[PDB]
DNA sequence: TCCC
DNA sequence: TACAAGGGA
């Protein structure tokens, strides 16, 4: 077994690199592989050698660059180019780094340098760092080129993200799904199915993409990959990026879970879909306060939240069919 | 169990087809602490039966069905033993949420 | 052969790693903060010779003395008996330490705290004399704060209890040295305070998701040759 | 001098410590995860909690407010008069007093002699170090755990909408239509019984951190670099700063909310020497912990003076009955 | 001058400060959650309330009403004459005076000198970024705890539905196609004994926040930007604004509801200095708390003047037995 | 003790259809009975209409109404004397008032 | 300095 | 939601 070690830098960046490990592996093969979490290390056990790993990684980044060139110093509206790169200079910086990694890679040559990691792949990083009584010029934090590129691939292939414009500013909600016990190939590909490309939602009627929890509820409404985590424990790590007057910063880092929300949604949708998906969509669009009450009730299991959400929905435009009421009552138990 | 019928009767007071909009009764019965206020609220909710039946008969759609007396005593015989307000809360909110269902009455 | 043991009941502790914006709070309190706590206690009790002209120099020399009294540099251990959870707060936290941007700048920043009902911390000493043993016992308490000032800590009980060479599964924290020799956690907690070093640490907490936040509880590592008994419960501990 | 207070205080209908507001006209409150017993279960709940930093800022405001009355109030920074207190940085190395007097920052002695806010709340001089931590420690404001255990359910958080009206020139409500009156923003209000714990190390006021004693005549008498009279004056100013703390002057949105406040119960201890912090008010069994701690402290031989409000705190202890926090500070200023 | 007022006011059949939304009809009143004892574990109850924002707005209205008659009434914002609370909203950087003159929002001194409403009630200018904290603060109008405990929760609300009689000129009630506003809508009216607490800080009026003192002769002389007569007029107008306060002018729907008031008891304290806020009247044991507060604050060394209405207090300390709220404000203004 | 069902069945005859007699006044008065005396008075007005209903039911081809037995009256009396608590009085009042409105099949 |  | 406050090539 390769049991390839993963560098310890940041349990968010470490997650990204050790979790793009698998997407680099699958394109080259590497069957019967597992990912053991160590809190932050996220070690991986595989029966693969290095060459197939490199072929898989270069195939993944070749597809990445093929997608990048489809739109256009070339700036494309991609997840790794402009969808998640909050900084304008990174829009060009990241593709150049990716193509340099390629050019070094097809000729069987290891990397020889290091690059600065944006705040997108790790919110724990930044520009400065308090040493004793002040900060450093430039960016003290830097990572290896191969780890940077492979973490970018892992972020682009698995982790969902939602952008909303609202004029000059822009909210970008970035989520990462993390195991804590054990995963195999099939689970990881099920997680991969969650990722959806070009989530440039913009628009004005869909204004509830602010309040990140509501945005992820909307995204999970239309995601039907698998109900995998009803038997396996998983967590979600979320953060937000803002463009308030060209002032980019991170203003939200709450860490709750993802299992029970979609579990309640999945137990909520047995009866039918024709009155379920439109139900949630109407409550989200019309009764934003009602949707907030509903999501709070899901998060903290309080009876009055469901009643308040239903009342707010019915007041404006929601039909509130009978079967959804029966499903809610069955959820109450 | 004897919840669907009272749910339909309560929803008869919220549907747009009945242009009366009695939200005070459902709001009061939803927010109940102990026996007396919930009993008073359900009494006030069921007191509006004649106006509902007359409006349904004048509109042409079938009249609403009042809950049968067979399960009327069920509410009482289950509710006295609910000394703890906590287990009372689940039913107090279940009736309220059943009051807000679609319940297509007049086609 | 004596080991101090003091339990601190606190709302929060906000000691964190090297990080920007977010200060990534430690999963368990570091050895450096624990050493600094009783260094502050001893310099407060007896400023006759442990207090010098420079506060930093006095603290550093107190730390040197206390680590000389320690059997090893990686000595202090903690017990996460209560669950460990993490929450996020948006604090004003003006970042005026940057070189420039005057002093009337207000950057709304964001931090996280760690919530835990209580903790137990152990201070292993060698053959300490009574004339200083009483002073160290006095310095065991008066640990009002750990890490960030807003993270108040209240030591309710502190005592000297001998290991008596009991056998029990490991409970107290320990460096990742014998655990590898025999759900496994790896950390770095900056063994000594940095003044103008880092070793792989095993972390004895595992995940049990009964509620929204998974939090952490006992992982019960294997049996160890040394253990300590408190109120009828025996807990493992390793010493060099 | 060395005083520590801890207790439970009941307050409701407040929006204190808003969690950074919100983009979509929705302002929330800072939330806190709390683990509690649920009959053999470690359950987690969401509760409001005021940060320690906010109490710190309010204590500084009260101290600078009371220090203006005394004639020795000239020794204060210009920032304090404007309720500032960032206290300098890399680009600043000269202190401006109320009258505009230049103060140099090479040594802590002159800094604490010429400035009062920096003496009690500390300061920071990155150019020359001289770091001084504040002598007042404020913990987070958490609701007591027994209240959460008893209530467990119910939001106890009410979201209310307010509108700001901007009518047109003659009588119109404007061209923005009445879908929003002119604007509709949202505010959240909490309700519950909270626990607090504050530590005042007033024994070091006026004593430089690096020189606790000067010790040249073979006696460890304190190195009071400042005048003793105005040192004592700073002492009662800091003590009286606590009066507009447990009265309704904590948090934000004072104009629109002014939280309905009342102190439920508390225990305070005072001594002339360093003493340990007792307990936070979040725990349900804090009274017995206080009894054990005071028993241990008196057994070891500390001169502890105890005051109790709405709590027996044992019987063999020579506790002094207290009717209000102002009576407590009136009894404290005697020393 | 620093004054604190706290008491209990009776009320019945009041539709004050409702949400007014939730679709198109059934105007439903605002409520809040409060914690009470109920001889068991602490329980949270759901009761009608009035937000302090409404009280602040009505205090501003009363201050303007009693300040126009003053000779210094010209120094007032144009929006204040319209009872408009939009103090320096988004975009604009200048304001219009009552006489048509313009003022630039650059420095706090000029703003507080030429504009009176922005002085007492503070202001926010996002464009220039200017800030001024309001000198008046108010709490919510919550029903007192003992009343809530005693009534055991009859929901303390009633719903009254009424219609519009919009009829066509021909005399027939047309349908929706013809066009007729004959429609029903409901309003929620509450009742009960409520407590209130309002704090004023008139000792800082006319003083810019940035530079409270000037230090010419080496004493902390307050930086009075306006004439002392104008400051006194502003203070007396702010005080007299309390006369219509506890009379029936703190609520909405006055054209159809006009809430019925009778102040049952209250206590006021004035000490022209830094004074802790009194205990809100919502708590049932606030009388003894305020009595202890005033007696031990007087013993501490502060000169507090206490005026009481319908409270025994402690009968061993100097307290003025005032009989009316306007008599109380007369006593306050006679000592300025 | 089962007499609650009987008295509620009797009161149901005052509101139900096929009767042309709709005395919501007495039913509401019994429902809102703050004190015991007005509750007894409301029960008296409820019983005072018995002859009209018992004649008209046969006049309109309907089964005779279930007039409460004297044992039921004795139970109602005794319970009103040992119940002096308004709290239990209110719940008992709404208890016997709730049965008035129901889907009773008085006339098959 | 350029670059939003 | 109005304003500010920022991350980088």
């Amino acid at each position: 077994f390769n049991e390839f070690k993963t560098p310890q830098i940041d349990p968010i960046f470490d997650l990204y690199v050790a979790y793009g490990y698998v997407v680099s592996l699958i394109r080259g093969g590497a069957k019967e592989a597992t990912l053991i979490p160590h809190g932050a290390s996220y070690l991986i056990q595989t029966d693969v050698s290095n060459e197939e790993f490199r072929h898989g990684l270069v195939d993944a980044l070749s597809s990445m660059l093929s997608l990048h060139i489809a739109l256009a110093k070339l700036v494309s509206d991609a997840d790794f180019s402009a969808g998640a790169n909050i900084n304008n200079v990174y829009w060009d910086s990241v593709p150049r780094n990716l193509e340099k990694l390629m050019k070094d890679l097809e000729k069987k040559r290891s990397v020889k340098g290091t690059a600065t990691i944006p705040i997108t792949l790790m919110p724990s990083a930044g520009k400065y760092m308090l040493k004793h009584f002040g900060v450093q010029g430039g960016n003290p934090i830097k990572v290896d080129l191969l780890n940077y590129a492979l973490a970018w691939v892992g972020f682009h292939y698995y982790t969902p993200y939602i952008k909303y414009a609202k004029g000059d500013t822009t909210w970008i909600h970035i989520y990462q799904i993390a195991p804590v016990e054990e995963v195999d190939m099939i689970s990881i590909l099920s997680l991969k199915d969650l990722k959806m490309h070009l989530p440039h939602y913009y628009e004005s009627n869909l204004d509830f993409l602010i309040n990140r929890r509501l945005a992820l509820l909307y995204h999970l409404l239309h995601s039907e990959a698998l109900e995998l985590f009803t038997e396996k424990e998983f967590v979600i790590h979320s953060y937000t990026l803002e463009r308030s007057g060209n002032n980019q910063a991170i203003r939200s880092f709450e860490e709750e879970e993802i299992g029970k929300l979609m579990d309640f949604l999945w137990k909520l949708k047995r009866r039918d879909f024709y009155h379920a998906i439109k139900f949630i969509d109407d409550l989200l669009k019309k009764a934003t306060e009602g949707a907030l009450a509903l999501i709070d009730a899901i998060m903290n299991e309080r009876l009055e939240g469901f009643y308040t959400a239903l009342k707010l929905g019915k007041k404006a435009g929601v039909v509130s069919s009978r079967e959804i009421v029966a499903a809610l009552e069955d959820i109450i138990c | 169990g004897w919840i669907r019928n009272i749910g339909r009767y309560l929803s008869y007071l919220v549907d747009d087809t009945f242009e009366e909009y009695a939200y005070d009764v459902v709001d009061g019965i939803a927010k109940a602490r102990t026996q007396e206020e919930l009993l008073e609220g359900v009494y006030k909710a069921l007191r509006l039966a004649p106006k509902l039946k007359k409006k349904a008969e004048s509109k042409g759609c079938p009249p609403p069905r009042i809950p049968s007396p067979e399960d009327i005593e069920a509410l009482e015989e289950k509710v006295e033993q609910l000394s703890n307000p906590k287990d009372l809360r689940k039913l107090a909110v279940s009736l309220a949420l059943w009051a807000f269902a679609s319940w297509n009455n007049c086609p | 052969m004596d080991i101090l043991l003091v339990c601190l009941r606190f709302p929060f502790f906000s000691v964190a790693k090297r990080s920007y914006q977010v200060r990534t709070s430690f999963l368990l309190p570091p050895p450096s903060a624990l050493k600094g706590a009783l260094a502050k206690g001893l310099i407060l009790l007896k400023p006759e010779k442990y207090a010098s002209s420079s506060l930093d120099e006095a603290a550093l020399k107190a730390i040197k003395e206390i680590e000389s009294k320690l059997v090893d540099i990686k000595a202090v251990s903690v017990a996460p008996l209560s669950p460990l959870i993490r929450n996020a707060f948006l604090l004003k936290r003006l970042r005026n330490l940057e070189s420039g941007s005057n002093a009337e700048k207000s950057d709304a920043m964001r931090r996280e705290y760690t919530f835990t009902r209580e903790l137990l911390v152990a201070y292993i000493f060698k053959n300490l004399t009574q004339e200083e043993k009483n002073l160290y016992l006095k310095a065991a308490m008066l640990i009002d704060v750990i890490g960030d000032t807003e993270s108040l800590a209240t030591p309710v009980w502190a005592s000297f209890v001998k290991p008596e060479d009991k056998k029990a599964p490991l409970a107290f924290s320990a460096p990742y040295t014998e655990i590898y020799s025999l759900r496994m956690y790896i950390e770095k907690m900056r063994v000594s305070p940095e003044y103008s070093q880092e070793e792989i640490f095993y972390l004895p907490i595992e995940e049990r998701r009964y509620k929204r936040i998974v939090y952490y509880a006992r992982i019960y590592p294997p049996e160890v040759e040394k253990a300590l008994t408190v109120d009828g419960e025996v807990l493992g501990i390793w010493i060099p | 001098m060395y005083v520590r207070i801890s207790g439970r205080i009941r307050l409701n209908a407040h929006s204190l410590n808003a969690q950074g507001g919100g983009g979509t006209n929705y302002i929330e409150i800072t939330k806190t995860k709390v683990t509690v017993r649920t009959e053999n279960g470690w359950t987690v709940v969401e509760v409001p909690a005021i940060t320690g930093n906010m109490l710190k800022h309010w204590h500084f405001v009260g101290f600078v407010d009371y220090f203006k009355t005394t004639p020795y109030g000239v020794n204060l920074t210009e920032r304090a008069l404007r309720y500032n207190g960032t206290r300098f940085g890399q680009g600043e190395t000269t202190a401006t007093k109320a009258n505009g007097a230049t103060v140099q920052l090479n040594d802590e002695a002159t800094i604490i002699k010429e400035l009062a806010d920096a003496d009690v709340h500390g300061f920071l001089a990155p150019k020359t170090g001289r770091r001084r931590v504040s002598l007042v420690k404020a913990s987070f404001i958490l609701p007591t755990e027994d209240f959460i255990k008893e209530v467990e359910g119910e939001r106890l958080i009410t979201a209310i909408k307010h509108n700001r009206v901007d009518v047109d020139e003659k009588g119109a409500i404007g061209s923005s239509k009445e879908g929003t009156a002119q604007m509709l923003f949202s505010r959240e209000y909490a309700t519950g019984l909270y626990g607090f714990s504050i530590v005042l190390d007033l024994g070091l006021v006026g004593i430089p951190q690096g020189l606790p004693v000067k010790f040249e005549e073979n006696q460890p008498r304190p190195n009071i670099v400042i005048d003793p009279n105005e040192r004592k004056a700073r002492i009662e100013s800091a003590l009286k700063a606590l009066i507009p703390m447990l009265s309704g002057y904590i948090g934000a949105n004072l104009a629109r909310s002014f939280p309905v406040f009342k102190v439920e119960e508390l225990v305070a201890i005072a001594s002339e020497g360093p003493i340990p912090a007792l307990v936070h008010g979040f725990y349900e069994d804090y009274i017995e912990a206080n009894r054990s701690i005071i028993k241990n402290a008196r057994a070891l031989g500390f001169n502890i003076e105890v005051f109790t409000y709405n709590v027996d705190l044992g019987e063999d202890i020579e506790a002094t009955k207290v009717s209000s926090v102002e009576e407590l500070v009136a009894n404290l200023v005697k020393m």
Side-chain angles (χ1 to χ4, degrees), chain D residues 150 154 161 164-166 191 254 256-258 260 326:
Chain D
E150 199 268 359
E154 295 144 347
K161 58 184 181 182
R164 53 175 318 290
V165 186
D166 185 13
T191 290
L254 275 298
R256 278 83 65 193
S257 305
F258 199 49
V260 172
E326 61 157 27

Side-chain angles (χ1 to χ4, degrees), chain D residues 108-126:
Chain D
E108 183 180 359
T110 182
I111 290 168
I112 68 172
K113 184 208 285 292
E114 289 293 327
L115 318 175
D117 46 351
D119 194 11
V120 63
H121 279 259
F123 65 97
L124 206 42

